Amino acid sequence: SGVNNTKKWKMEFDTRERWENPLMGWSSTADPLSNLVLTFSTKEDAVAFAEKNGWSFDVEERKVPKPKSKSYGANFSWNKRTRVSTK
Amino acid sequence: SNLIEVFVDGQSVMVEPGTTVLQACEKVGMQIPRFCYHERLSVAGNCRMCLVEIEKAPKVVAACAMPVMKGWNILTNSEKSKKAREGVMEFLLANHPLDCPICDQGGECDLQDQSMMFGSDRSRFLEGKRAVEDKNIGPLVKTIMTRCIQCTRCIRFASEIAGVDDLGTTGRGNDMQVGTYIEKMFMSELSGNIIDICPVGALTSKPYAFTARPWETRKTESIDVMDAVGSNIVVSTRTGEVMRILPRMHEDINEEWISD
Amino acid sequence: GAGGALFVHRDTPENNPDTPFDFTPENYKRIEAIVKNYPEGHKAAAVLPVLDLAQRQNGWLPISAMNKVAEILQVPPMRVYEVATFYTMYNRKPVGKYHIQVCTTTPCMLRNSDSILEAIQKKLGIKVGETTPDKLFTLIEVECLGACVNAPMVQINDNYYEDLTPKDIEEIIDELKAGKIPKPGPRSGRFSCEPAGGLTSLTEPPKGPGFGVQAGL
Amino acid sequence: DNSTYRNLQHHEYSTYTFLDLNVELSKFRMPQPSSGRQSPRH
Amino acid sequence: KKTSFGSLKDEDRIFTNLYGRHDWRLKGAQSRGDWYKTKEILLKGPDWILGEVKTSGLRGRGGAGFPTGLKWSFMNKPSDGRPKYLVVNADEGEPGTCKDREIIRHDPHKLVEGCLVGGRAMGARAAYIYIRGEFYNEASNLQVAIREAYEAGLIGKNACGSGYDFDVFVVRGAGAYICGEETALIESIEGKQGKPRLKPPFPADVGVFGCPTTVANVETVAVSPTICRRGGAWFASFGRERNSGTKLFNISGHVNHPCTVEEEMSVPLKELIEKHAGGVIGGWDNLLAVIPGGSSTPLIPKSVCETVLMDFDALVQAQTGLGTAAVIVMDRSTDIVKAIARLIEFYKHESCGQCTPCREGVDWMNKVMARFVKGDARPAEIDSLWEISKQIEGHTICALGDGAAWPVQGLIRHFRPELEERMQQFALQHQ
Ligand SMILES: Cc1cc2nc3c(=O)[nH]c(=O)nc-3n(C[C@H](O)[C@H](O)[C@H](O)COP(=O)(O)O)c2cc1C
Ligand code: SF4
Numbered sequence A: 001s002g003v004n005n006t007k008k009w010k011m012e013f014d015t016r017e018r019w020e021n022p023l024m025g026w027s028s029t030a031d032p033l034s035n036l037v038l039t040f041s042t043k044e045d046a047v048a049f050a051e052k053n054g055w056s057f058d059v060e061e062r063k064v065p066k067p068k069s070k071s072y073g074a075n076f077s078w079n080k081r082t083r084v085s086t087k
Numbered sequence B: 001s002n003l004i005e006v007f008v009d010g011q012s013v014m015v016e017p018g019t020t021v022l023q024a025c026e027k028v029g030m031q032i033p034r035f036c037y038h039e040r041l042s043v044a045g046n047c048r049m050c051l052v053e054i055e056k057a058p059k060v061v062a063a064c065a066m067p068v069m070k071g072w073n074i075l076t077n078s079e080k081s082k083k084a085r086e087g088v089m090e091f092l093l094a095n096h097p098l099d100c101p102i103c104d105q106g107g108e109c110d111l112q113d114q115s116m117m118f119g120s121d122r123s124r125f126l127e128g129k130r131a132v133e134d135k136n137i138g139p140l141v142k143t144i145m146t147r148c149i150q151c152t153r154c155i156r157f158a159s160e161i162a163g164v165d166d167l168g169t170t171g172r173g174n175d176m177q178v179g180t181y182i183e184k185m186f187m188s189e190l191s192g193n194i195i196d197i198c199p200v201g202a203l204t205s206k207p208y209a210f211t212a213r214p215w216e217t218r219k220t221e222s223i224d225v226m227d228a229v230g231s232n233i234v235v236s237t238r239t240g241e242v243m244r245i246l247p248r249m250h251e252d253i254n255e256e257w258i259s260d
Numbered sequence C: 001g002a003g004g005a006l007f008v009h010r011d012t013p014e015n016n017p018d019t020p021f022d023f024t025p026e027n028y029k030r031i032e033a034i035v036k037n038y039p040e041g042h043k044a045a046a047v048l049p050v051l052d053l054a055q056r057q058n059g060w061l062p063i064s065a066m067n068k069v070a071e072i073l074q075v076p077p078m079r080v081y082e083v084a085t086f087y088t089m090y091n092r093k094p095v096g097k098y099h100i101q102v103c104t105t106t107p108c109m110l111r112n113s114d115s116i117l118e119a120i121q122k123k124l125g126i127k128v129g130e131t132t133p134d135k136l137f138t139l140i141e142v143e144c145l146g147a148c149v150n151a152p153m154v155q156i157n158d159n160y161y162e163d164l165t166p167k168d169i170e171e172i173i174d175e176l177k178a179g180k181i182p183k184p185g186p187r188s189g190r191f192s193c194e195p196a197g198g199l200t201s202l203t204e205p206p207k208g209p210g211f212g213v214q215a216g217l
Numbered sequence D: 001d002n003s004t005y006r007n008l009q010h011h012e013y014s015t016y017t018f019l020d021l022n023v024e025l026s027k028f029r030m031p032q033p034s035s036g037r038q039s040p041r042h
Numbered sequence E: 001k002k003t004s005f006g007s008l009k010d011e012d013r014i015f016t017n018l019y020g021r022h023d024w025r026l027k028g029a030q031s032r033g034d035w036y037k038t039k040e041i042l043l044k045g046p047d048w049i050l051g052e053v054k055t056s057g058l059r060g061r062g063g064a065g066f067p068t069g070l071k072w073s074f075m076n077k078p079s080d081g082r083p084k085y086l087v088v089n090a091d092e093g094e095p096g097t098c099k100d101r102e103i104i105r106h107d108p109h110k111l112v113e114g115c116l117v118g119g120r121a122m123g124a125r126a127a128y129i130y131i132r133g134e135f136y137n138e139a140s141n142l143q144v145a146i147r148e149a150y151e152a153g154l155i156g157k158n159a160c161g162s163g164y165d166f167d168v169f170v171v172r173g174a175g176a177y178i179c180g181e182e183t184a185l186i187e188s189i190e191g192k193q194g195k196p197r198l199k200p201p202f203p204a205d206v207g208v209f210g211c212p213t214t215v216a217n218v219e220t221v222a223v224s225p226t227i228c229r230r231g232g233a234w235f236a237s238f239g240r241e242r243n244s245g246t247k248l249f250n251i252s253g254h255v256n257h258p259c260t261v262e263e264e265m266s267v268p269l270k271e272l273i274e275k276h277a278g279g280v281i282g283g284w285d286n287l288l289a290v291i292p293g294g295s296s297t298p299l300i301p302k303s304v305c306e307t308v309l310m311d312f313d314a315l316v317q318a319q320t321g322l323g324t325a326a327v328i329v330m331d332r333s334t335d336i337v338k339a340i341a342r343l344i345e346f347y348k349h350e351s352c353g354q355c356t357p358c359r360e361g362v363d364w365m366n367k368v369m370a371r372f373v374k375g376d377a378r379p380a381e382i383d384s385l386w387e388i389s390k391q392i393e394g395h396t397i398c399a400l401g402d403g404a405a406w407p408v409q410g411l412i413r414h415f416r417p418e419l420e421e422r423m424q425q426f427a428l429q430h431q
C-alpha cells in the first residue's frame, strides 16, 4: 500500500534478447543499455533529455487514483445496500 | 463552496465535508501508516495503526475512520502519534511467526517495511507465541494463517467486491481465526485478488510459491488479452523468464484487480 | 487459560451436513413470532434467538442445524457459523443432559469457590472439562454469572443455586441423580441477597401510591 | 408480611416458557416498520 | 448544604421490592406506587420530562457516569423518516455486579414503566430489552410482566390513554461480556457478532438497524419514572453536587454478610461495609484492599479507603472511579496478585478481539500476570508491564481495553513491594 515509489518520472529502454548460457545456464544479454534507468523530476525534463540525446520516446501521462469518499456510517445503513453482513 | 479548512502540521488545506483525517493527510502529501484500510473496501478500524494526534485533543483518533471538521490541526509526526504507532507494531509483532526467510512476501511485506519505518527495533515479548492450523481454500491461494494479523481485508473484499460470503471470523479473543469454518474452496473469477490485498504472507500465490524474490524481478507494464476488457497488467520477469502477472491501477478499466 | 475447543469443523459420521434436523411445527410458530418481533427487511436480527431455539430442541448445534437456520432466515451460512462460534452458550458438541457451570471469577474465588469444584470433581469422578461415561452430567468452568453477591454459585440448565457448600452441592448432584429436580435458589435459609441477620433496609411497610408526587401533577 | 418469600413461581418454569410468552404477546403489538426492501442483499 | 451522607430513610428508597418480600406482579407494583399517574407524565410532553431529568442530576449507572439528561437530549430531534428506538442495557457482565438482576426479577413493572417514560421523552417508537442469556428465569419474569402490562392496556397501541404507541421487546444474548458495551449490544441485536463499532457515528444518529438509538442502563430507566413523579429536586437533594441521587451497592468478597443495599450516594466506604454488610471478616484491621466499582476500576488499599466516599468525583480523585458501585473486599489473608491475575484472565477470555491492542496486549498481560503469580519474572519487567498497559489504554475501540489496563496499573501502583518480594523469594528458592 506504499506510494513512495510513484513520485518521480522514470526513463527506461526497451527489452531486447536474452538467452541461456550454454555453460552453467546463466542469462546472457547482448545489449549494454538493458540495465539503464534514469530518474527525472518532471515529464518535461525527461522529454528534453530524450530529445537532446536523440532517442525516440514514448511518454505516458501519470495516473493518480481519483478521490474516493469513504464513510464509516454507511456500513450500518438502515435501507441502502451498503450494509455490511459482518465486520 | 462548502469546503472546510483543516490544518496538517500547521499547513492549511481545503477538504470537502465527510473527508477523513487520512485523506486530508494524503491531500497534503503524507501517507498515514495503515494495515486494514483499503480505499476500495469499507472502513474497518481494526489494526489501529492509523492512530494520529489532533492538537488540543487528549485522545488519539483513528485517521482512517474519523471525519475531519473545521479547525483541526493534525499532528502526524508528534510524539504521541509515534508512540502509538510503536505500540501498535509491538502488539502486531508480539505473536507474528519468525517466517521471514521462508515467507513468500519477504521483500514486499507491509509489516516489514512499516516496522522498519514506524516501529521499534527490538522485542520485549518474553512469552511463547501462538500457532493456528492452515486452511485449504483451493489450488490458487496458498494459506498460512499463522502469519495472519486479522485485518479482515479479505473478508470485506469477498463480501463486497466478489459478492461471495465464504470468508469470516470464527472465535473470540486472541484465538479468533479467519477462514470458512468448513472444508470449502473459495472459488470465484476474482479469487486471486485476495493475495494482493492481504498485507502479510498469510495468503500467497500457490503456483508462484518459492519461485522468486521481489527485488530480483523486472517489471514490464503491458495489457492483458485473455478477455475484451483489456485490463492493465505488470509482467514480473526474472532473467528472461516470466515469473508472474500483477494487476496495474487504472480507474477506468479494471480499477486495481484482474481476473483469475 | 487455554480454551481447548476447536473453532474449525471437520466432517464426522455423527456431525455432517447430512445429519437429520428439522423444526417441529410449534418451533415454527415460535420462529414466526421471533421474526415478527424485528422490523421488516432485517430478518437477520433473528439469528441469535432462532439458533438458541434449535439448541433447546436438540441439546446441541450440529452443522445441519446451522445450515437449516441459515436457510430459514435467508442469510449466508458463514454468518451463522460466526454467530455460533462467537457466543459461548452455543454448544457445538454434544453435552450431558445436566450442564454444570461453576463460576470461578475473583468475587467467587474469594469465597472459596475451588472447594465446590473439587467436590463436584470427586462426586462425579471426572475432570473439569470432561463428561460422565453415562452421559448425564458435564462439568465446565465459567466466568461471572451475575450472582457475585450470592457467591459461591452454580448454574445447571437455566437454574441458579447460590450460597453453595460441598455438602449442598453433593446433595444437589445426588437429587439430580435420583430424578427429582432440586429447587433453584440460595442455600442456608436465605433468599435474594439480603443480610443474613442484618436486615438493615426495607423493614417498615411500603408506602402507597402517590406518596410524594410533586405539585402540578 | 416481609418474613416470607414471594417469588416461588420461577420454580415452575419450563424450557419453552420464554418463547411461549413471546408467541402469545405477538398479537398485542403494532406492525413493524419497513426498510423498503426484502433484505440488504436484495 | 448537607455535609454528612449515608443515612437513607427506608421510606425514601426507590426500589421498595428489592429483596422480593412482596408481590412482584402488576397488583404488587400498583400497591407500591408504580403505574401511578403515568398518563399525566406522558401528556406533559418530552421537553418537560427531559428538563426534569436534567435538573435531577441523574448520571449514568452503567459505569460510564455520563449525565443521562444530556445523553437523552440528543435523541430529541424532528423525525427523519426513520424509527427511533430505546435500548436497555441488561447484560450485567461486570464481575461483582448484581443490582440489575435483582431489580429485573423482583420489580419488573418499574423497569417497564421507565422504558415507556424514556421512550416518550426521546420519542422512541419501541424499546428493546437485552437481558443476559444466562438470566433465563428473570427474563421470563420480565416477559410475564410485559404481558400483564399489555392486558391492562398500559403499553402498546394507545398506551395509558395518551394516544402514544410504545412496544416493549425482550431479546436474550448468549454468554458475552463484551455485549454489555452499547455498540456491541447494538451489533448483537442486529444479529452479528458482539463487536463494538467505532464512533462517530454515535447511536443517537446511527444506532440499531441504522436508526437513531439510545442505550440506557436498567437502573437509570428504572429510576426515571420515580424521579418524574416525585420531582427532580427531591432526587437532587441526596448526595453531593454533580453526584446526586441514591445508588444500589453490591458488597461482596470477604464480608460477613455480602448483600445488595440501596443507599444515599456519598456514603463512606467504611460506613457502608460496617452498617449493611456486617463488616470485614476478622475485623476492620483485617482489611487489605477493596475494588469499589467492579473489575474495571483499580483497587485501593486500606489507608485510602479509610476515609473515602462513594461518588464519581471523590473516587476519581482517589485514582479509581465509581464505575458500577460493585464493592469487592479482600482481607489480609488472600493473594491479591492471584485475584488480579484472575481478573486479567477473565478480561482475556471476554474480549471480542477485533482490534489488535486489546486482543494481543490483554493476552500478553494475562501471560505476564500468570508468571508474576509464581514470581518467575524479574523486577525490570514490572515497569515493562506498566508500559504495556499504557500502550493499551486509549488506543482501543471500546473501553474493555481500558478496563483491562486499569486493574494492572492499580495493583502495580499499590503493591509493587509485594510483587518484588514474591519474585525475590522465587529467585531464592530456585537459586
Ligand atoms: C466491555 C464493557 C461491558 C459493559 N457491560 C455493561 C453491563 O453489563 N451493564 C451496563 O449497564 N453497562 C455496561 N457497560 C457500560 C456501557 O457503556 C453502558 O451500559 C452504556 O454506555 C450506557 O450506560 P448508561 O445507561 O449508564 O448511560 C459496559 C461497557 C463496556 C466497555
Ligand atoms: S508476513 Fe511479512 S513479517 Fe511475517 S514472516 Fe512474512 S515477510 Fe516476515
Ligand code: SF4
Pocket: B147, B148, B149, B150, B151, B152, B153, B154, B155, B178, B197, B198, B199, B200, B202, B203
Ligand atoms: S488473511 Fe490477510 S487479508 Fe485476511 S484477515 Fe488475515 S491478514 Fe487480513
Ligand code: SF4
Pocket: E178, E195, E196, E350, E351, E352, E353, E354, E355, E356, E358, E359, E396, E397, E398, E399, E400, E401
Ligand atoms: S478493546 Fe477488546 S473488546 Fe473492545 S473492540 Fe477492541 S478487541 Fe474488542
Ligand code: FES
Pocket: B033, B034, B035, B036, B037, B044, B045, B046, B047, B048, B049, B050, B051, B062, B063, B064, B065
Ligand atoms: S488503518 Fe485505520 S484502524 Fe487500521
Ligand code: FES
Pocket: C103, C104, C105, C106, C107, C108, C143, C144, C145, C146, C147, C148, C151, C153, E095, E096
Ligand atoms: S463472580 Fe461469580 S457470578 Fe460473577
Ligand SMILES: [Mg+2]
Pocket: B105, B195, B196, B197, B198, B199, B200, B201, B202, B203, B204
Ligand atoms: Mg499477501
